[PDB]
Amino acid sequence: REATWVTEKPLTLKIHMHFRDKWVWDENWPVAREVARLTNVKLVGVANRAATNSQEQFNLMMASGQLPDIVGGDNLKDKFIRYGMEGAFIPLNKLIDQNAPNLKAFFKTHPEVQRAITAPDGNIYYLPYVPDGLVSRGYFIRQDWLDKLHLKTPQTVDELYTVLKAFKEKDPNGNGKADEIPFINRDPEEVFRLVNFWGARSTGSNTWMDFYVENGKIKHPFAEVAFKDGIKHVAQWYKEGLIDPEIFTRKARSREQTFGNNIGGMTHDWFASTALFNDALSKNIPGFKLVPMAPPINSKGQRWEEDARQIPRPDGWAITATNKNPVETIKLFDFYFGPKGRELSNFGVPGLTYDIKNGKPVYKDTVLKAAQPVNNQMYDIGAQIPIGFWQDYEYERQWTNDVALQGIDMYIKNKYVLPQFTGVNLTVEEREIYDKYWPDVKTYMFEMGQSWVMGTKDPEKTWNDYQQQLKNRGFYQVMIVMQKAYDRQY
Ligand SMILES: O=C(O)C1=C[C@H](O)[C@H](O)[C@H](O[C@H]2[C@H](O)[C@H](O)[C@H](O[C@H]3[C@H](O)[C@H](O)[C@@H](O)O[C@@H]3C(=O)O)O[C@@H]2C(=O)O)O1
Numbered sequence: 001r002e003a004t005w006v007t008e009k010p011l012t013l014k015i016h017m018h019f020r021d022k023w024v025w026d027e028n029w030p031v032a033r034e035v036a037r038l039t040n041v042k043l044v045g046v047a048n049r050a051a052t053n054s055q056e057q058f059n060l061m062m063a064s065g066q067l068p069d070i071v072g073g074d075n076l077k078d079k080f081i082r083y084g085m086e087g088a089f090i091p092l093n094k095l096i097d098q099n100a101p102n103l104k105a106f107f108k109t110h111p112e113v114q115r116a117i118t119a120p121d122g123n124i125y126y127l128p129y130v131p132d133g134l135v136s137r138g139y140f141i142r143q144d145w146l147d148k149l150h151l152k153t154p155q156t157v158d159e160l161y162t163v164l165k166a167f168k169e170k171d172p173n174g175n176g177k178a179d180e181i182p183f184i185n186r187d188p189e190e191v192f193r194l195v196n197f198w199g200a201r202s203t204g205s206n207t208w209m210d211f212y213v214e215n216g217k218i219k220h221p222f223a224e225v226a227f228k229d230g231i232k233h234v235a236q237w238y239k240e241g242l243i244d245p246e247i248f249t250r251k252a253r254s255r256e257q258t259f260g261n262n263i264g265g266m267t268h269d270w271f272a273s274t275a276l277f278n279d280a281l282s283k284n285i286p287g288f289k290l291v292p293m294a295p296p297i298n299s300k301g302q303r304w305e306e307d308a309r310q311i312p313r314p315d316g317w318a319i320t321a322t323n324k325n326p327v328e329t330i331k332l333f334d335f336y337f338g339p340k341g342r343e344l345s346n347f348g349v350p351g352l353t354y355d356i357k358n359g360k361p362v363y364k365d366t367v368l369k370a371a372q373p374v375n376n377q378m379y380d381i382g383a384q385i386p387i388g389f390w391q392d393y394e395y396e397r398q399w400t401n402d403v404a405l406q407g408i409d410m411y412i413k414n415k416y417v418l419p420q421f422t423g424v425n426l427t428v429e430e431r432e433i434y435d436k437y438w439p440d441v442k443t444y445m446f447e448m449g450q451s452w453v454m455g456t457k458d459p460e461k462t463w464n465d466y467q468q469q470l471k472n473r474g475f476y477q478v479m480i481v482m483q484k485a486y487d488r489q490y
């Protein structure tokens, strides 16, 4: 028996959690085993580890008969609310009040977080991933390539064009081949964010393709004329090879590939793990120097950083109506919001990845000095995963090197980050419209965006058909409920 047990008799529950298009819940994970030991509840995964689309696996789950006990993963907020309101997920409000003292206290001190996860019917259908921190991404460029080519740090988009074209054409890696790829990115959606250079938004928050507000009016980035004109410019840089030809396909290991083989020039990504490549690659590429850059002055005369940490994220886990142990389940979930649960869910396992020293969790040198970023190392053992959990920025500070710190400090000091969208409070009827049309409109928008970047559709010529399709697919119906909600509120 342990003081932390949430049941005297051992309990096993089934969880469907497929996440990040790459991972599933693993009961053999060190963190899972530790939580199961401390709480007496073991979670067994039932998701398909061979699939590469987490959203489609949610959908396949929901269509494969009786639900498991718990469902978790990234980018599931809207599915948890839509299916909660229908009954597939249960409201957690009273379970929390009666049985989850850590969460009850957390929500009292984080009313914004409780607001963000509550549905139009007043119910909480999931517990979120709660990030910790302020900035997330920033621009990084190869200083050593700038110096090889005698180029200054670009300050405007026109200066940046010249620098990326030089990276492409002037052989900065010195191997006689035109193998350099000026701009790379782990995230396909960052290609859409390049429209910021031409004064257009791509998303209002860390959630991809989110709405934004301008002067009191709700807008969607992909519907705006500025997006049509901006995406033309992105398509031109893609045509000319300044953007990775594989930007929609290469994905998670883009940095390992392109910086590791000295062919990537620039990216837009999270400060800590991106700056770590200076340290990981120092033996193999002695003068490798990837450094933060201020955003270039864009066509609207401003230096935009569109992204920031979003507290909470639309990620987490929920209790299904078939779970026969909802009270033991909410107690298990509450364990993660207590001190020990929070330590494990962030740092891994004591004696394995960290030690308590002077009362604080301190990562081992083998973790801090490893070639893989520490968050990647955490995923592999079941930490830093998008369950309901409260991230602790102290985990990240320990592997935030001086290059990263000086980039984060620059961005915070100079206020590049744009105000983020914090959502609206829909009514039940407005929510019906949103759930009926929005998910499919966002899919269509992405498809058209990819077509525009790769040049298989010309944005100027297809823009009218596209706007008629937005109307036909319900987009303006959603825009109007969003605006009504905004107005009602504000
Ligand atoms: O890399 C960092 O320096 C960094 C520090 C923070 O502590 C987080 O660990 C942060 O993690 C983010 C990842 O870098 C990456 O952007 C990840 O993207 C996910 C996305 O959120 C979503 O789950 C889905 O689309 O899959 C993406 C992916 O992993 O394939 O988001 C992480 C985050 O915690 O938001 O990185």
Ligand SMILES: [Ca+2]
Residues within 6 Å of the ligand: 171, 172, 173, 174, 175, 176, 177, 178, 179, 180
């Ligand atoms: Ca070369």
